[PDB]
């Protein structure tokens, strides 16, 4: 069932992508072509072109993305050729470093080679490239992160136990047991240390973060072939920052020491002050990152050009499917047009998709 | 068929009322007065214990309510026995002066006659018993309130037209074709002029909103019966008013003017002046009311109290069915438990439901 399956979401996939593309009489051709591949290996393999835009269609299918205004400007950058951990290592180190882009953020994405019978050829741990490991007696770290950084001293890796330690990459090619680590180069990871225009006091809080969220334990499916391994990235979102990863009680919590140094008392909630203080971080760090000349986008003008997406899709004949409960900013949400209506949360292929985490 | 559902409805919830109460061993008798009342007369009616506990019972399952702690303290006014105009008029007058309280509003709810064979005994028009009219050539007062407004003016009345202009209680008779107005005495409507802390400035934006947010236009279903006529009320939450009524760019909109205030700029979106003209603005609110001596409550207490009521609900073994799009503040989201957490959002009757506005 699987080689029908596969066949199926091949046929939907061709036609729709190269209607797009402008290309619909190529579809007969090539989809013969990949009927034989089919029976022949048991799959098919995707031209540079074909992966390219389904990559970009994944991502205008991304109900939960707000920033789905650029899906056809995405860089996509195919890695399928990749054999060994050095060449799996040295991708991920371009990726960081093509996405970085001196601050000018690239919204890119590496094509890994897919699942074959249903098993993987790579398989990366991390949840994100670049992310800040996680411990606990008291809280040190992300929270977030506490279960892959058990994983990663399970293997012999051993953070020096800040805050924000950066995680090694970690993963597994086929054929191995055990997935292997390697440690990021200081010089390759943009950070951005938080700091107040107004406020100067707010750097004895010591905060910071990284420069790119790239993601990188999903699924990209494109036509019946599950691209496992497959790291996608854009840029943050202000409230990402300071309203979730910072302030976010099972996260870093800062809202207290941050409502502590704004001079406001934490006595009362009728004082709002736990709102106050959530203001106050996000403009604190849009002014980071901006300062800093690293890309970042806050939360209206997020709403305003996926607006201009919503308006779009309808100009080009495409039915429009999102997420409310993860479109709206956790910061003010009723002050975007996306409070005020409504949004169908379909799965529609290509997209990208959850899996089950390695380690835990 | 309606013979029949309204049985069913009735067994249901004859049942599972008795049981709460302790009243198990009544529920025989009681359904088969039921079955007899429904053959002879083609309908039944609700005992004052009944009916009241229906009313509550109605409260602890609407999914919306964030408010919903308190849901057995509701003070059920039992009125099925109005029989005219002027009684109607006083009960409706009575409710708002029970309610109010001087300040420390009662949660309360005034139980009006049933429909009958599908057609409404009494019929109210008002969305809620205090609310403001709105008008149109530039925005004078709540545009969610223009539809009604005119509706009134087509009725004789007719507002000085400034932005809080109170609209007359409006209703229909059975066997009225037309329903009849009545002026709100202003000696009955508490007000509460908004004003800010430590910024004395804020008094020029001359804002105020009314105290008793009674909600008139919705029927509560309790086992087969319909009471399209059963005003409510609870009390305030500060967000309702200061980022809902106040704040959006389709009611009042004063987030331009409350940031001019303020003393912010407007300019640029990163600087987040929607967001601290918001959390000023709610503070003034919560504030405004509290020194009135008019009960209110903030979205962080609501919310802690919310919590109480989900483990209540827990503790008693009782699912728990909730709005999640409805439940979070407009105001920081993902600062209250609500926001991580998911919610059934299933209909159980006893409930609330909207009902097809007479106007428009
Ligand atoms: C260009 C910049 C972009 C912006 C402003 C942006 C922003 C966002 C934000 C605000 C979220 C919510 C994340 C969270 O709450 O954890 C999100 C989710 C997501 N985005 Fe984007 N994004 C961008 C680029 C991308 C790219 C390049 C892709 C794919 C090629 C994409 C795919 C997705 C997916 C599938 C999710 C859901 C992630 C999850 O559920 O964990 N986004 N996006
Ligand atoms: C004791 C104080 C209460 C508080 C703090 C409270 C609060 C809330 C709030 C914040 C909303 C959202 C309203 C909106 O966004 O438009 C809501 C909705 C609602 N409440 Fe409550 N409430 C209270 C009392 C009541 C009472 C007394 C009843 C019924 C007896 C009740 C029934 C409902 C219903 C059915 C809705 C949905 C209204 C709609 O969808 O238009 N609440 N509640
Ligand atoms: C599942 C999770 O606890 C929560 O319900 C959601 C809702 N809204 C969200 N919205 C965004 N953008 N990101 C999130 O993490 C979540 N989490
Ligand atoms: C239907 C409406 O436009 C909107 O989607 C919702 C969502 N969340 C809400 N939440 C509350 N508490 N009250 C509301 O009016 C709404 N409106
Ligand atoms: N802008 C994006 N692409 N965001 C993807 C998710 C990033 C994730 N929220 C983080 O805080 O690291
Ligand atoms: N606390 C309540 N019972 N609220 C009911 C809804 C009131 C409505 N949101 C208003 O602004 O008038």
Redesign the pocket.
């Given at each position: 069932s699987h080689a029908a399956i596969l066949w199926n979401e091949a046929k939907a996939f061709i036609a729709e992508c190269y209607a797009e593309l402008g290309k619909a009489e190529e579809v007969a051709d090539r989809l013969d072509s990949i009927k034989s591949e089919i029976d022949l290996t048991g799959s098919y393999v995707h031209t540079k072109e074909e992966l390219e835009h389904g990559a970009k269609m994944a991502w205008r299918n991304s109900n939960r993305c707000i920033?789905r205004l650029f899906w056809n400007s995405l860089n996509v950058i195919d890695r399928r050729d990749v054999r060994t951990k050095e060449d799996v290592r040295d991708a991920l180190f371009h990726h960081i470093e093509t996405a970085t882009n001196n601050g000018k953020i690239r919204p890119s994405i590496t094509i890994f080679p897919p699942e074959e019978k249903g098993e993987k050829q790579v398989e990366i741990w991390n949840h994100?490239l670049i992310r800040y490991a996680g411990y606990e007696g008291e809280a040190i770290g992300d929270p977030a992160s506490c279960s892959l950084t058990a994983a990663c001293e399970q293997l012999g890796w051993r953070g020096e136990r800040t805050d924000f330690d950066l995680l090694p990459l970690i993963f597994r090619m086929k054929g191995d047991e055990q997935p292997v680590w390697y440690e990021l180069p200081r010089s390759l990871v943009i950070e951005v240390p938080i700091t107040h225009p107004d406020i100067e006091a707010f750097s004895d809080l010591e905060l910071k973060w990284y420069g790119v969220?790239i993601?990188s334990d999903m699924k990209l499916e494109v036509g019946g072939i599950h691209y496992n391994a497959a790291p996608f990235?854009?840029?943050?979102?202000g409230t990402?920052?300071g309203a979730?990863?910072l302030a976010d009680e099972k996260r870093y919590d800062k809202l207290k020491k941050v409502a502590s140094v704004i001079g406001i008392s934490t006595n009362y909630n009728t004082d709002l002050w736990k709102d106050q203080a959530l203001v106050e971080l996000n403009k604190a760090v849009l002014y980071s990152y901006k300062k800093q000349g690293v890309s970042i986008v806050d939360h209206h003008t997020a709403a305003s050009q996926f607006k201009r997406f919503e308006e779009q899709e309808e100009e080009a004949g495409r039915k429009l499917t999102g997420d409310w409960t993860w479109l709206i900013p956790p910061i003010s949400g009723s002050a975007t047009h996306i409070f005020h209506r409504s949004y169908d949360n379909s799965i529609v292929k290509p997209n990208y998709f959850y899996q089950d985490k390695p380690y835990e």
């Open positions: 920033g994100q969220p993601i990235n854009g840029w943050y979102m990402e920052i979730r990863n």
